[PDB]
Amino acid sequence: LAPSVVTGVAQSSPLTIVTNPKEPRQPVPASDGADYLKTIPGFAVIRNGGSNGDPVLRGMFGSRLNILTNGGMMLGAAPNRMDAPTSYISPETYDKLTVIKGPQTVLWGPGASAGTILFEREPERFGELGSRVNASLLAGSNGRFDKVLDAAAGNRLGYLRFTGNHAQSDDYEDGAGNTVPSRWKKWNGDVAVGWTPDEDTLIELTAGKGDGEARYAGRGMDGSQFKRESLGLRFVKSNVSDVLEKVEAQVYYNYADHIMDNFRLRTPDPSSMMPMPMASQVDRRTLGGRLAATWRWDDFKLVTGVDAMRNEHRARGSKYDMMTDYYTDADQFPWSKDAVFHNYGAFGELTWFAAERDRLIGGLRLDRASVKDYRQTLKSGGHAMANPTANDTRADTLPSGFVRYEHDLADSPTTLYAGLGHAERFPDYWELFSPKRGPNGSVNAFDKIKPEKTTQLDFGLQYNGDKLQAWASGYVGVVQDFILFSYREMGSSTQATNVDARIMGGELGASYQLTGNWKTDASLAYAWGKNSSDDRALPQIPPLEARFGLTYEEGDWSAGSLWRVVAPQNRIARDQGNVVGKDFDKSAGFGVFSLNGAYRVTRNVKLSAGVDNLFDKDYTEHLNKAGDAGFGFSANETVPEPGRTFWTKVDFSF
Ligand SMILES: [Ag+]
Ligand SMILES: [Ag+]
Numbered sequence: 001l002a003p004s005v006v007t008g009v010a011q012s013s014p015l016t017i018v019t020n021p022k023e024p025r026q027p028v029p030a031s032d033g034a035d036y037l038k039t040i041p042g043f044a045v046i047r048n049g050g051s052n053g054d055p056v057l058r059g060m061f062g063s064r065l066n067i068l069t070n071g072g073m074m075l076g077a078a079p080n081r082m083d084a085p086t087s088y089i090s091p092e093t094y095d096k097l098t099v100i101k102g103p104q105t106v107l108w109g110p111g112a113s114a115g116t117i118l119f120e121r122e123p124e125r126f127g128e129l130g131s132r133v134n135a136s137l138l139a140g141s142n143g144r145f146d147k148v149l150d151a152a153a154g155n156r157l158g159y160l161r162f163t164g165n166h167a168q169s170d171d172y173e174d175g176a177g178n179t180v181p182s183r184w185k186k187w188n189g190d191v192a193v194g195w196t197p198d199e200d201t202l203i204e205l206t207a208g209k210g211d212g213e214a215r216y217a218g219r220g221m222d223g224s225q226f227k228r229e230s231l232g233l234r235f236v237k238s239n240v241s242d243v244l245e246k247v248e249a250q251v252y253y254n255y256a257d258h259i260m261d262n263f264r265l266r267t268p269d270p271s272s273m274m275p276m277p278m279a280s281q282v283d284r285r286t287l288g289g290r291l292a293a294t295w296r297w298d299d300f301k302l303v304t305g306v307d308a309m310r311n312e313h314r315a316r317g318s319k320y321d322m323m324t325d326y327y328t329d330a331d332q333f334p335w336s337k338d339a340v341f342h343n344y345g346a347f348g349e350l351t352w353f354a355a356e357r358d359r360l361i362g363g364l365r366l367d368r369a370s371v372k373d374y375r376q377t378l379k380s381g382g383h384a385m386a387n388p389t390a391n392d393t394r395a396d397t398l399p400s401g402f403v404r405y406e407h408d409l410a411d412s413p414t415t416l417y418a419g420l421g422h423a424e425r426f427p428d429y430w431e432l433f434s435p436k437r438g439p440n441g442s443v444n445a446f447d448k449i450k451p452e453k454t455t456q457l458d459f460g461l462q463y464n465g466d467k468l469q470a471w472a473s474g475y476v477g478v479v480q481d482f483i484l485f486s487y488r489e490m491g492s493s494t495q496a497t498n499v500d501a502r503i504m505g506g507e508l509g510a511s512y513q514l515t516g517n518w519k520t521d522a523s524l525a526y527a528w529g530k531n532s533s534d535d536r537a538l539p540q541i542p543p544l545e546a547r548f549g550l551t552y553e554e555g556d557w558s559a560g561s562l563w564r565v566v567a568p569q570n571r572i573a574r575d576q577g578n579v580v581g582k583d584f585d586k587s588a589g590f591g592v593f594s595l596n597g598a599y600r601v602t603r604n605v606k607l608s609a610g611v612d613n614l615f616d617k618d619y620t621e622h623l624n625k626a627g628d629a630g631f632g633f634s635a636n637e638t639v640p641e642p643g644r645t646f647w648t649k650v651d652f653s654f
């Protein structure tokens with residue numbers, strides 16, 4: 001044993017990473033999904049404030065990542081993604097985090113060109129009647145405090161389960177001593193009812209609520225509300241037949257209700273295009289379901305099924321009378337619906353266990369996607385505009401698939417693997433509705449922006465020895481009709497556009513067990529992108545970074561140190577980027593050092609602590625948003641990362 005603090009997660013199967021998100025993590029995560037991804041090589045995060053980052057996998061942002069929770073899809077509503085999908089996930093309340101890199105699965109939905117991320121809670125198992133609880137408290141610099149509870153009781157026939165958290169922090173300071181407008185509050189509460197009549201059968205109803213707020217250094221407005229509401233139903237029957245091994249069915253309902261203003265966590269900037277109190281409410285309603293069957297016989301295992309998904313987006317805004325001074329809050333007006341999306345798909349995955357050391361896996365899916373523009377007018381400022389595609393529909397049929405070959409050697413515990421994958425993605429809400437202009441000669445983005453089609457070779461290896469566990473994965477790929485934002489400056493209007501891209505990169509890591517008490521590990525992540533249409537680099541691409549860890553674990557306690565070293569990024573595309581951010585300047589390299597320890601006091605209680613960024617280094621990341629002028633940020637000066645921070649955490653388990 002010996003407890004420890006997670007500083008990196010290795011890749012354990014080909015293309016696949018699996019971690020328990022309840023373990024303490026050494027750059028301490030701000031209780032959102034993006035922060036639990038940056039201990040996994042290949043992930044980078046766009047900082048908005050102190051929480052709610054936007055994840056970026058192998059340089060690929062946004063909906064190119066398929067982020068699921070218990071199989072279902074949570075989508076946000078902000079026109080510029082202040083509430084990215086991960087800003088509604090609290091990883092600590094889940095039991096398992098899985099990443100599958102590359103377009104190398106078809107089981108979990110459409111258009112996951114960059115990868116799939118699966119936060120899961122696993123069903124309770126009870127034999128005798130009994131109960132279990134595991135909780136945690138964290139406390140740290142800048143008023144950071146986190147409560148987490150996960151209790152359950154039941155017997156052989158069924159169970160009731162509860163998971164909650166509350167978490168907050170004030171503004172953090174950067175290395176220079178400057179207070180950064182960060183600071184955020186988040187709470188979640190979720191219940192699950194489970195019924196297990198016999199041991200083949202399981203039915204489970206889940207429901208949950210969550211809310212939060214966040215100040216955003218890198219935005220003209222702040223998130224004063226992040227309301228979530230969630231229901232799901234799941235059926236899993238095992239051993240139906242001699243070949244039929246599993247049948248799973250699930251329905252999910254996720255509702256997001258975001259508010260966005262410039263007066264509840266800030267005062268309106270008198271010197272900006274926005275001196276008046278302004279609020280804007282937006283919501284997102286996702287309904288979806290999946291039905292899959294797993295056949296198993298001889299040397300094969302086939303998984304077939306279908307899925308479907310609908311989601312709806314509405315908005316409404318406030319009003320300020322300048323003639324007098326009256327403010328009419330946004331909830332006094334009806335919701336204007338503006339978009340509805342539809343997807344249905346059928347998919348299958350075949351696996352061939354070609355004896356001992358040889359595995360071939362192939363999969364396919366066909367998707368019918370479609371969208372309707374419900375905007376009756378457009379916004380053009382307080383005065384409105386005709387929307388030329390009002391009530392227009394458009395649709396498409398998009399096939400996807402992959403083959404992958406896995407080979408074990410006889411000599412060493414080494415697996416090699418190589419895989420080819422193709423993935424087509426329908427444009428999402430932000431790609432179709434958020435740009436102010438479409439491609440050249442279009443009426444708007446909705447009318448013209450084409451799907452995105454990714455073809456990519458993935459390859460790598462695993463070495464799972466005794467003293468040394470190493471891994472590596474590379475990727476080479478082309479992207480046709482990459483959806484690309486370009487920015488002009490009155491001031492900041494975007495144009496969505498399709499271009500052709502080449503992409504390549506990879507991750508590699510190793511963790512060597514020096515003695516019984518000494519462990520070191522290392523990792524490296526590189527992404528690269530070219531815009532072939534305009535012959536230049538792709539924008540918003542994270543630079544090369546390495547992580548160096550060293551751990552001493554005696555008995556019952558451990559101490560760790562971690563170095564993070566990031567190269568500069570000189571490959572940039574000025575005024576290009578996505579719906580959230582844009583490149584402007586080349587970034588500086590930097591180094592950050594941190595310390596941690598853990599101590600198991602009993603089989604039920606364990607302690608851990610750390611200091612992040614010991615030397616109070618004043619630094620920023622290449623992908624961080626530009627800090628807002630109203631907070632005293634000069635042009636294109638991005639949001640600084642936090643300076644030295646201290647945290648301690650206690651973990652209960654009964
Ligand atoms: Ag916003
Ligand atoms: Ag206004």
Ligand SMILES: [Ag+]
Nearest residue numbers: 221262274278
């Ligand atoms: Ag505003």
